[PDB]
């Protein structure tokens, strides 16, 4: 049960961190009208 808990925490944190630091990586510039 705890093993499943820590695995799910690992997965959730991984994807949430990817989302967080991906939208923080100057996402507004990723448009076809840049330059």
């Amino acid at each position: 049960m705890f093993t499943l808990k820590i695995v799910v925490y690992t997965t959730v944190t991984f994807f949430v961190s990817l989302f967080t630091f991906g939208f923080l990586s100057n996402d507004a510039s990723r448009n076809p009208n840049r330059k």
């Binding site: 705890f2 808990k5 820590i6 925490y9 690992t10 944190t13 991984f14 961190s17 990817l18 967080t20 630091f21 923080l24 990586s25 100057n26 507004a28 510039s29 840049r34 330059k35």
Partner: protein
């Protein structure tokens, strides 16, 4: 359940991934960030990547 632990963290083990995985992601993001032109701008958004 219903115990009131902060972020559901009842075991101290749960914190190791919760703090480290953002830190590895932060380290990877810092290589991107340090490469950017971090001076100010007067625009609605930054067009420099």
């Amino acid at each position: 359940e219903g115990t009131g632990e902060a972020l559901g963290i009842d075991d101290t083990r749960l914190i190791v991934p919760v703090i480290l995985i953002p830190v590895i992601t932060f380290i990877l993001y810092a290589g991107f960030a340090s490469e950017q032109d971090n001076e100010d701008f007067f625009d609605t958004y930054d067009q420099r990547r």
